[PDB]
Write a protein that binds this ligand. Structure first.
Ligand SMILES: CC[C@H]1CC[C@H](N2CCOCC2)CC1
Ligand SMILES: CC[C@H]1CC[C@H](N2CCOCC2)CC1
Ligand SMILES: [Zn+2]
Ligand SMILES: [Zn+2]
Ligand SMILES: [Zn+2]
Ligand SMILES: [Zn+2]
Lengths: 360, 360
């Protein structure tokens, strides 16, 4: 059975489980069940399933090099699908709540869940809570007797928390740290002193890399009972690196990829986000250019946003991107090596992850 | 050591742990640590700590009848405090997100967290996520080697999910079930056919009783290693009953307790909530009164809200409350009995829970 077909089948099975348990154990009625099935489909399906599929792909790699009964291979693949769906639903939880937080209009060329006429923010916040609770219901049901249950739950729990901290770093990235104060409305930075490479790195590492790269790779190891084929410090370092790279790309596309191809109107400029472009720009600009950046950044006025766009386009940022890109290709290859020692299999999965990221 | 002093001390210890781990392991900076410490204090302190204190009180009851070393008594009390704080922080998570969902202004005579000038909804949604993640960080840290770890986590997980489902039942309680549809904006019910005792009961059971009553009692048993001193079906039935009773009181006070004494302007009438008053009113009203209720309910106009208030006050609802109150006193006493068999200790704790609820 092809891996995608398997992964999508398991969604139908998990959905049916969740909804069936709502009726048999939570006293739900058919119309509320239907609303939650619609919610589930709309918030969880539609992407490429990169994150869930990585869990499957890692597990399929160990299956080729490890002796097992047929029934065990099937169980391991089924566990990888369920775990992959836990990461997809975790993502979904975050997408729903982030879109509410940020006033987003569209994602994947379709309205944000909260903007659906019969949803509203009042329901969408809680819909998002339910999405994350589902991930735990899946874990406890499907993995109740698995030796990896504790490690999976503890790992999931740490990644979730990192992601939340990451969101906090992100939403506060345009404030002066020393000005943060629940009692006082937060002004945007005037100096941009906190738009550094290290600070950017901290945002991206927590907000994205933990859930997008670390968790799918390690989940694959956990369901394969194969955490000993790796040096965990290496899996960390490689995932952080691939993760950062991926966010840099999204940061560049927010600005420069047409809204139709992007699936949303990018607003990082008007939101004053600490993006790769703003940081990298500020790292090379002269005093006149820094002045002009400061006069136009984080402002809804399209002229001022077009001013920021002009500075970036004129600053030869492609040269900086290319150089960052060469250094990451370099470091990632070195990490794949250092992993190839213990597991050609895992190094190969990490190689494929890297390729899908690099080639998008 | 008095139990409250102990419980509050453990908060300072857990806070210090959480914040220290953010700095040593999540790369946090002092001003973001301060923002989260403020967040934590403002969202988690200020109530009576009924829910967390019940965990402690249950455990103190078993300590009086069970042989243990001093060091073990201290460990059990410390575990009960931590677990009690997990329920308090779970509550906090829900209060923060609910207040955002509902457009609330005040709770406990102070502004809702999201309304604080340097918070905003963009941050408060995620602050709420962090609050719930904290409960898991506490559990994994403090209970890492405890035999009850799995049962605690699985229980916590089910209660959380029930609470979320409960919120869904609550926010949709004024819609016709057959009209729920993410694609279509939801009109308020015109027939009130779903304002029944059974339906009300389903809302309250999921939204409130699981986290307020079931979880503190069972957590106390779990940390005491004492789940065998009880028939779990009885602990369930008694908690549902005490839980319903408590919500009926809050439903009555939303309407009839002055805003200064209540700590918020009650809006159940204008929100068209399926409250004990609306259900009980509709269960005894004549055709003329039902007409008048339908013409005035779920409307911001203070005259129409004062019209609903007049109907209730004229409908002799105190007679219905008194009768409900006698039947619950009756059934709760019967349940305490049925529990007294296996554990005078646990029956006594449940007796105290009941008294604190009944006497408020
Ligand atoms: C294309 C890169 C995107 C992927 C989605 C990322 N965040 C969405 C909301 O919170 C979770 C993570 C932001 C970067
Ligand atoms: C005095 C009774 C109150 C206690 C708080 C209840 N809910 C608040 C928001 O979600 C969690 C539960 C509503 C009833
Ligand atoms: Zn965001
Ligand atoms: Zn982006
Ligand atoms: Zn509410
Ligand atoms: Zn209320």
């Amino acid at each position: 059975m092809a891996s995608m077909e398997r992964f999508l089948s398991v969604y139908d099975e998990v959905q049916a489980f969740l909804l069936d348990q709502l009726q048999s154990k939570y006293e739900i009625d058919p119309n509320r069940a239907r609303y939650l099935r619609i919610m589930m489909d709309t918030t969880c399906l539609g992407g490429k399933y990169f994150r869930g599929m990585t869990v499957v792909n890692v597990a399929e790699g160990f299956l080729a090099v490890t002796q097992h009964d047929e029934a065990t291979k099937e169980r391991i693949l089924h566990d990888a699908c369920v775990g992959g769906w836990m990461i997809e639903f975790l993502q979904a939880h975050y997408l729903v709540e982030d879109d509410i937080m940020d006033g987003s209009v569209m994602r994947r060329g379709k309205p944000c869940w909260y903007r659906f006429p019969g949803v509203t923010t009042q329901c969408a916040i809680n819909d998002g809570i339910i999405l994350k609770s589902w991930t735990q219901i899946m874990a406890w049901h499907y993995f109740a007797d698995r030796p990896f249950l504790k490690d999976l739950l503890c790992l999931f729990q740490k990644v979730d928390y990192a992601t939340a901290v990451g969101q906090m770093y992100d939403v506060t990235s345009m404030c002066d740290s020393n000005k943060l104060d629940p009692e006082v409305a937060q002004p945007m930075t005037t100096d941009f002193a906190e738009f550094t490479p290290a600070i950017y790195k901290r945002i991206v590492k927590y907000k994205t890399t933990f859930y997008t790269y670390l968790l799918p790779l390690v989940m694959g190891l956990l369901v394969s009972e194969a955490a000993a084929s790796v040096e965990m410090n290496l899996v960390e370092r490689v995932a952080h690196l691939i993760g950062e790279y991926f966010q840099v790309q999204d940061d560049v596309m927010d600005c420069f990829t047409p809204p139709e191809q992007l699936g949303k109107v990018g607003t990082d400029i008007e939101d004053a986000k600490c993006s790769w472009l703003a940081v990298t720009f500020l790292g090379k600009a002269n005093a006149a250019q820094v002045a002009e950046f400061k006069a136009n950044y984080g402002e809804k006025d399209p002229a001022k946003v077009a001013v920021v766009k002009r500075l970036y386009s004129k600053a030869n940022l492609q040269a900086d991107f290319a150089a960052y890109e060469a250094e990451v290709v370099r470091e990632v290859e070195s990490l794949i090596e250092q992993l190839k020692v213990k597991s050609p299999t895992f190094a190969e999965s990490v190689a494929v992850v890297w390729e899908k990221t690099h080639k998008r």
